[PDB]
Design a binder for this molecule. Structure first.
Ligand SMILES: [Cl-]
Ligand SMILES: [Cl-]
Ligand SMILES: [Cl-]
Ligand SMILES: [Cl-]
Lengths: 337, 339, 337, 337
């Protein structure tokens, strides 16, 4: 396979089946079904169309299973999945209520909202692993923290420090990232709902009320459309790379102590090297999300699709990093003399 | 010169003297002088030495003049300015109080603290310019905001929208970046005071008291040393590129609108200022990668990672600064938006 | 799926099954078998063990199939496939000849050689596609090349030009990249054969002759080991990015001409935008391979795994770009007034 | 100043005045005079205007001093120096002859040719420094090469190697970089001469002849205009980073050996750490030149000006790297146990 994260043998090291499952084609489609179901309900609530048409959409979509091969044919034909997805959804809905699915929405609305739904779940997992890792590393520090370490500054031995002193440079930044992530998670996962040209012209003056209701139903933040405003995507990408960056410092430290040999015992430091790799991977990948801030006019295919290529691997690198760092810390049997 | 920001002619387009002068050798030395002065005062305040010894350091540093040839020679020999700087400062201090300048501090303490003092200054300028530009762009939208525009999605004409619809994509992210900056500036400019191996071993139990007073005197946040913790710098650099990125979207829009030619009127006759915004966006989008690579800063101190930040960050704050200058210039050229 | 290149629906746009199948675990395993097959033969040739010892290896590995799941657990245990892969290869070989597989080799030898064998295959497909695309764009220019076009310099209508004038900016760099790729392919795909610490300490005086024979059998260049010398990889990735870059310039022009709409007929320009995307993708990933030039000591796991993460998608991006560009050119019905 | 390369005290470590003075406003201007002097000579040779007017331009620009302030107002008015520069040049040339300076040329013609003229000079300096350092590292190798070293693979002590073995990983790629540079320098520094939209409209059938003559006179390659074809610039930039990447590998090895301390003597390995810094700097900047490959239409101010911002510092980082490595090499008094 192209990426080691999903590779049938290399995933023994780089694997993260829990985070990767959220970027599966099935998970995307489920979240896209969620968008369309909630949209129909929000539009009934605002009396755009009748209640019995929205319930026909809900029940029609409740047991909706997609034809994957035909969805691929869709993106081969159109460039984007949603017109063929919507076609399949209308085929599942009884009566004239099928003409009402996807009303007022555009392709970017359903794709970006699905992304935000799944990024939200990925961030919950990442925070949980972050808090557990902070505890594990804290246990490494409370076990061996009093023991002397030879300090090292600029590749030379320096004065003696302790294990607690060195550990604080691993743990304290991780605590900051947890807090950064928790603050982000409060309103950073936003509904994408702006219509063909970002103006919601099919909804007129009901635009604001439908948007509010749809956001609440999906558990997402109500914000005006951000079809070309991608600063929250780059902000989340920054955080991802901040976490890998700190864990790569941890990995670089452990590998150096391993090479010196006198001041650790491990149960060769492959996990430590893997942390550095992932740090440097995310530090490269951050550039692509920042290049994608320049998204011209109302919708930019060039800028938008660079995020498709690069973001899922950034959140996987961060999750893998947390797994591998947990595996490394269990290998550490003593720090210090 | 190497950079267009400082170039004798390319600065007609790329220059920002107000921001760039925060990265002058002189401005750096002044901030290092302030560090060493306040360190002396902080240590007398924590009863480490008496008031008259700190006062000998304070008055000696007030009329201290650094020798620049010598300082350059010092970084050739040592890699770092402060040993030679401290050597010179001691010569400006009379008596045995000269032995006490720089007590408890290491070179990364004075270099990073100086950087934070001056990045704080630059952040105040950038915040103010962001605020002004938000208003300017708001005035563009109030003048022509109900006027029709041809929407354009994925390089094809879409349905009609208004000028205020398109302008919200310029204005709204900038308003978020203003708020991001203000939040960062709350406690993000921190004192660097850790000593030789990050443990402030010279001060003992008085390390917390000295650090607290030193941070106060310099107007920086009191936080444990971050010699190898560079997340605040990567976070700050992220915001720098967030601003240029949005402004490059704005510039790209204007340039496309200029090329079509039917729904914009630019004065001066073309869209060089618009292209420049795009260039600067792509510049910082590249440079952000450098500060993220420097997150891996091994052991108690890492020359390799730390010096990458020296090569890259000042031009990132300059690009953000220049972008705000260029965005304001471009907006002043815009006579009409819409039909 | 993390990458739209392999995605069950996004591959309708980004797919390239021919190039992607070169990075499958099966193709890797088959390449690694070839390394170990030809290694035994080269060592028999230099009289290190008997001919029938080598022949038992050749035929035992001819019908070798890997236990993929056990290989996954091998990389979890060891950090790298090869110890496990070798253990299974030994069970497939009859007699005392089983001890002779992998003699004189290290894990990086078999992995980097496998890479090089399959990258040579990828570069062949990419050069064949490049030549064919140059014909196609040449056919566009011999149909419409006489027609006038509005020149555009720095986002402003400039003076008139012709279609041949503009098309030369598409064709000429591609012709240079073809020659570039052809020149690299001469001796740029090299054998990796250095043993534990790069010295081939198992072979003594027979090192030079074994390596030469092994390189010749595999169709690879005989160079001294390059375990920590990754400039040829970065050089190759540069080339990969050079191709997508030019095709991104092509895409950007087509997308711009489509927006204006008066001097092109297509048959909305998703393909033109996709090329711009893949250009900016490869212009980011090139950074990873250059960060990987810093590879410490005799083997750097941190620098080497960054290539694992990033290079397969660079060759796929280049390959997909050529596919998409061939599709985009086939949509162009008219250029000019 | 913004960059340590030029900084009043930081240039103690990062300075390279010989390379940096090739990117001074003066060296730029002098190269643009050279373009314009040779332009008039080439055009009088092809009989586009009289010889007296050609030698009025040559002699007019012999003692040309630029009003620098005015040139800066010129880039604030036009975006580029040349319109104000060409205006100053017609004030230096007597008669009506002054109507002919810049005839048939555009802004990007003189700017990119100036660049090419000075990168050619930078590359000569870099090649010389590279050969000298190959010899210097070779002398370190021939002094201590037989002495035992502890091998380290994947941050762990491996079997014993010798000094000569490890030194080959520093020397052999640099010998390949030297040949790469010599191969590039033969035809890679080209004249830019395309006119307003790449078609040399003012020239007519004299186009090819004037371009051949101008390139000969300036000691650059005759190639067709590459206003929007920046592959030679990304190619050259790749080379620059290959050189710093290898020196960064050398630098990281020395830093690690100093930290262990048992197997070297240095007469605090700051130079070794600086080489890593310069490798990672260039490994980041290579991305900008590859992003600048997408250059839309006949001229792209956006992509072109990103080269302006990033390429001079890439050539300076390579230049400085070779200076720092040569300083580090002289500090090495012993390699080996
Ligand atoms: Cl779409
Ligand atoms: Cl230091
Ligand atoms: Cl290995
Ligand atoms: Cl121009």
């Amino acid at each position: 396979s192209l990426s080691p994260f999903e590779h049938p043998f290399l995933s023994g090291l780089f694997g993260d089946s829990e985070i990767i499952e959220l970027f599966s084609a099935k998970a995307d489609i489920d979240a896209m079904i969620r968008f369309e179901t909630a949209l129909a309900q929000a539009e009934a609530e605002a009396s755009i169309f009748a209640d019995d048409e929205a319930e026909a959409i809900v029940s029609g979509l409740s047991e909706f299973a997609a034809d994957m091969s035909a969805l691929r044919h869709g993106v081969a034909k159109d460039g984007v999945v949603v017109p063929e997805l919507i076609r399949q959804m209308r085929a599942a809905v009884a009566g004239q209520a099928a003409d009402k699915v996807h009303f007022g929405a555009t392709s970017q609305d359903v794709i970006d909202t699905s992304l935000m739904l799944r990024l939200k779940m990925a961030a919950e997992i990442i925070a949980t692993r972050l808090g557990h890792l902070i505890d594990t590393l804290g246990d490494l520090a409370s076990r061996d923290g009093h023991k002397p370490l030879t300090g090292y500054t600029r590749m030379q031995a320096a004065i003696g420090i302790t294990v607690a002193d060195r550990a604080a440079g691993w743990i304290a930044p991780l605590e900051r990232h947890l807090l950064r992530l928790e603050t982000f998670a409060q309103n950073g996962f936003a509904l994408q709902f702006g219509g063909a040209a970002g103006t919601l012209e099919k909804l007129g003056d009901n635009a604001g009320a439908v948007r509010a209701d749809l956001a609440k139903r999906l558990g997402l933040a109500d914000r005006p459309q951000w079809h070309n405003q991608r600063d929250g995507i780059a902000e989340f990408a920054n955080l991802l790379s901040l976490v890998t960056g700190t864990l790569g410092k941890f990995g670089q430290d452990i590998a150096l102590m391993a090479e010196i040999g006198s001041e650790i015992r491990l149960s060769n430091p492959v996990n430590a090297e893997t942390l550095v790799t992932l740090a440097r991977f995310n530090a490269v990948q951050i550039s692509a999300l920042h290049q994608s801030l320049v998204q011209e006019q109302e919708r930019s295919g060039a800028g938008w699709m660079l995020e498709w290529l690069t973001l899922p691997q950034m959140v996987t690198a961060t999750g893998t990093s947390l797994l591998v760092a947990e595996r490394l810390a269990a290998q550490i049997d003593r720090l210090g003399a």
